[PDB]
């Protein structure tokens, strides 16, 4: 049965990881997790997201392919870092190393870039040119990519050691220093180096910062990361207070000010969507709240955030002609951008680690567990989130501390 009373003591402290799928009465859980990885990382061109990169017939590295029928396939730091995270959780070292080799060689902006704000950050969008060779489309970062790279590398160090191709630990500390020096404003993760008073709630993963604090050696840096953790929980608490009731109707938004206020409308040239939309990025917020509750303990704010958001989506489904909740809402109104696909259902299943409503849990968990693994033209984002969720709901998303 679903545990509707999640502990205030996290798995990171206790060592006790929940297996949500087992609580929900499912069978062949580990088999399904393993097949999900094998299909995503297999050469089947069906579920596959992991592809080799060669130059003049010489093997170089691997990437997660952001398949895109509208604008041409590209390669993103979020997908790359999420792939590495999946690989370390399942002890898949070659896959990890092949992805990290690609990131460090081809995504990393040089440390002596003429723009100091780009030095050592990871270019969010690459493509292969007409002759098949990789190039940077946009050098600007997507800072949750760096966050997941640092997380994944610290875990690789802890599981595998640092004497092979990579000194994972040194690579992780370098990544942490880059985040602190290039991607933070007053200890809150940035949306952009070039815009102040701006964050993306989906980039806030408080438990990662607590993990960082426990994996750096010096006192000042331990305190720094513990403060980022506390400030991140404050940002999310404040954002969830601000989106409660009218006018945002309990869903978090794409962009926020540093006090948690949703950004209204457009604020910069190049912005993809209005700031107050619950859209593709915002899907991840309650996934992150579930992660935090599981790993670091559930408090009243985690439970309220997820219960009210899932409550809104359930309500929105009852008021939809297609009998689905949709991918994009603004001020509680459906924006006609399609029924929820696999990745949104996946994010919402992870959120259940902070839920106190067994009925909600049944509905949202079964809607996720009944899905086939993503295929076709939209499988990059759907399939990436599906993989992460499979780990989180099977007790496989764990923190592996380094020893000093």
DSSP string for 8-73: SS-HHHH-----HHHHTT-SSHHHHHHHHHHHHTSS-SSS--EEEEEETTEEEEEEEEE--TTT--
SS3 of 382, please? helix
Closest CA to 89 of 17, 176, 175: 17
Q: Can you tell me which residue has the tokens 């408080």?
A: 206
Q: Give 140's Cβ-side CA count (13 Å radius).
A: 8
Task: Report the distance separating Cα 274 and Cα 254, nearest Å.
Answer: 8
CB atoms within 10 A of CB 404: 7
Q: Euclidean distance between the first and final Cα of the chain, in Å? A: 39
Report yes or no: 381 and 371 within 8 Å, Cβ to Cβ: no
Give the DSSP letter of residue 107: I
Strands 277-278 and 329-330, bridge-based pairing: antiparallel
- Bridge partners (DSSP) of residue 64 are 50
Q: What is the CA radius of gyration of the chain?
A: 20
Rounded Cα distance, 158 and 215, in Å: 10
What's the rounded Cα separation, in Å, for the pair 292 and 278?
20
Q: How many Cβ atoms are within 10 Å of 237's Cβ, its own excluded?
A: 17
The Cα 156–Cα 346 span in angstroms is: 25
- Contacting residues for 152 by C-beta, under 8 A, at least 6 apart: 81, 84, 85, 87, 88, 96, 100
For 228, half-sphere exposure in the C-beta direction (CA atoms, 13 angstrom radius) is: 29
**Helix, strand, or coil here: 172?**
helix
Beta carbons of 11 and 298 less than 8 angstroms apart: no
Instruction: Please answer whether residues 369 and 26 qualify as being in contact, where contact means their C-beta atoms are separated by less than 8 angstroms.
Output: yes
Separation between Cα atoms, residue 43 and residue 67, nearest integer Å: 15
Resolution in angstrom units: 1.3
Nearest Cα residue to 105 out of 86, 119, 122: 122
Q: List domains and CATH numbers for the chain.
A: 1-404 (1.50.10.10)
DSSP line for 320-367: -TTSS-BS-EETTEE-SS-B--HHHHHHHHHHGGG---HHHHHHHHHH
Find the largest Cα–Cα distance for the chain.
Answer: 58
Q: Are 53 and 379 in contact (CB under 8 A)?
A: no
**Proportion of the chain in helix, strand, coil states, percent, rounded to 5:** 50, 10, 40
Residue 383 contacts residue 371 (beta carbons within 8 Å): no
Beta bridge partners of 256: 199, 262
Q: Which residue has the tokens 């506390």?
A: 230
Local structure of 271: helix, strand or coil: coil
Residue 50 Ramachandran class (φ > 0 left, ψ -120 to 50 alpha, else beta): beta
H or E element: which one contains 383?
Answer: helix 379-392
- Strand 184-185 to strand 134-138: parallel, antiparallel, or no bridges (unpaired)? unpaired
Please state, in angstroms and rounded to a whole number, the distance separating the CA atoms of residues 279 and 267.
17
Token pair 């985040």 is at which residue? 179
**Per-residue CA distances from 156 to 78, 128, 224, 247, 388 (Å):** 18, 28, 23, 43, 17
On the 0-12 / 13-18 / 19+ scale of CB atoms within 10 A, 259 is exposed
What residues contact residue 19 under an 8 Å CB cut-off, 6+ apart? 29, 393, 394, 395
How far is the C-alpha of 180 from the C-alpha of 190, rounded, in Å? 10
Residues 6+ apart with CB under 8 A from 225: 176, 209, 210, 212, 213, 216
CB 258 within 8 A of CB 232: no
53 phi and psi, to 5 degrees?
-115, 125
Q: b/e map of 152-161 (b: 16 or more CB within 10 Å)?
A: bbbbbbbbbe
DSSP-derived 3-state class of residue 244:
coil
Technique used? X-ray
Q: In Å, how far from its chain's centre is CA 32? A: 21
Helix runs in 161-205, H state only: 168-182
Instruction: Report the candidate in 113, 127, 19 with the shortest Cα–Cα distance to residue 73.
Output: 127
CA distance to 9, 24, 317, 391, per residue, from 358 (Å): 20, 10, 18, 21
């Amino acid at each position: 049965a679903f545990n509707n009373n999640p502990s205030s003591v996290g798995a990171y402290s206790s060592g006790t990881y929940r297996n949500l799928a087992q609580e929900m009465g499912k069978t062949n859980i580990q088999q399904k997790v393993n097949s999900t990885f094998d299909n995503m990382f297999g050469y089947n061109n069906t579920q596959q997201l992991y592809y080799p990169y060669t130059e003049n017939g010489v093997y170089k590295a691997h990437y997660i392919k952001a398949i895109n029928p509208d604008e041409g396939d590209d390669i993103r730091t979020e997908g790359q870092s999420w792939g590495m995270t999946a690989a370390v959780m399942l002890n898949k070292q070659e896959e990890f190393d092949n992805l990290w080799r690609f990131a460090k060689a081809y995504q990393k902006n040089p440390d002596n870039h003429p723009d100091a704000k780009k030095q050592g950050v990871y270019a969010w969008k690459l493509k292969l040119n007409q002759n098949g060779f990789v190039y940077k489309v946009d050098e600007g970062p997507a800072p949750d990519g760096e966050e997941y790279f640092a997380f994944a590398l610290l875990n690789a160090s802890a599981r595998w050691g640092n004497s092979g191709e990579f000194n994972y630990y040194n690579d992780a500390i370098t990544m942490l220093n880059t985040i602190k020096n290039k991607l933070m404003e007053n200890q809150i993760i940035r949306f952009s180096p070039y815009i102040d008073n701006l964050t993306d709630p989906s980039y806030h993963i408080p438990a990662f910062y607590d993990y960082f604090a426990n994996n750096v050696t010096n006192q000042a840096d331990k305190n720094y990361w513990r403060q980022v953790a506390t400030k991140s929980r404050t940002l999310l608490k404040n954002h969830f207070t601000k989106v409660s009731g009218s006018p945002h109707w309990n869903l978090p938004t794409f962009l926020s000010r540093l006090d948690g206020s949703p950004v209204i409308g457009y604020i910069f040239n190049g912005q993809a969507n209005p700031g107050q939309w619950y859209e593709f990025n915002a899907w991840r917020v309650i996934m992150n709240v579930g992660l935090d509750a599981h790993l670091m303990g559930a408090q009243a704010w985690h439970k309220s955030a997820v219960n009210k958001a899932l409550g809104f989506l359930s309500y929105a489904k009852t008021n939809n002609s297609k009998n689905c909740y949709e991918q994009v809402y603004s001020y509680g109104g459906a924006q006609n951008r399609g029924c929820a696909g696999e990745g949104q259902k996946a994010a919402n299943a992870v959120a259940l680690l902070a839920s106190t409503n067994a009925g909600q849990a049944n509905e949202f968990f079964n809607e996720f567990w009944s899905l086939s693994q993503p295929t076709g033209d939209y499988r990059y984002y759907n399939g990436s989130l599906y993989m992460l969720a499979m780990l989180h709901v099977s007790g496989n998303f764990k923190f592996y501390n380094n020893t000093f």
